[PDB]
Amino acid sequence: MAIEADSVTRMNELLEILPAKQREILILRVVVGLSAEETAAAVGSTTGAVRVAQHRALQRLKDEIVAA
Amino acid sequence: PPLDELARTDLLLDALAEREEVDFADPRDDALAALLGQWRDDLRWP
After folding, report:
1. What one-character-per-residue DSSP string does A28-67 give?
2. Which of A23, A13, A11 is nearest to A57 (CA)?
3. Which positions does the record tag as DNA-binding (chain A)?
4. A28 and A43 in contact (C-beta within 8 Å)?
């Protein structure tokens, strides 16, 4: 008898797939609630770079959901 | 144009971050946003 995984165990599962900088960016943007620029400053890249990485992360995430 | 892709993700993440509930056309979007919100909550939750 198996326990349905919680949001974090699940999301965590899906995060391991992401490159570490993309994962770091989603966390800052969503969990801390940093903006694109603030995230850029905290991570050392530019704002454009964050906007691309966070987008790629989101898509990657959408994909991985499909399989399963 | 691809440039609107970026703007749109940025806006989605900005809404997620402010805990704003958004209604998506594609239910899979809805599902993912929901999943992220719950995760956002748990991880903020000390």
Report:
1. IIIII---HHHHHHHHTS-HHHHHHHHHHHHHHHHHHHH-
2. A23
3. 36-55
4. yes
Asked if B36 lies within 8 A of A11 by C-beta distance, the reply is yes
CA-to-CA distance for A37 and A34, rounded, in angstroms?
Answer: 8
Amino acid symbol at A55? H
Number of domains in chain B: 1
* Domain that residue A19 falls in: 2-68
- Rounded CA gap, A52 and A64, in Å? 18
Measured in angstroms, the resolution is: 2.5
Tokens 């940093």, residue located: A34
Domain with residue B42: its CATH number is: 6.10.250.1300
Out of A32, A33, A62, name the one closest to residue B32 (CB): A62
Q: Which 8-state DSSP code applies to residue B8? A: H
- In whole angstroms, what separates CA B40 from the centre of its chain? 10
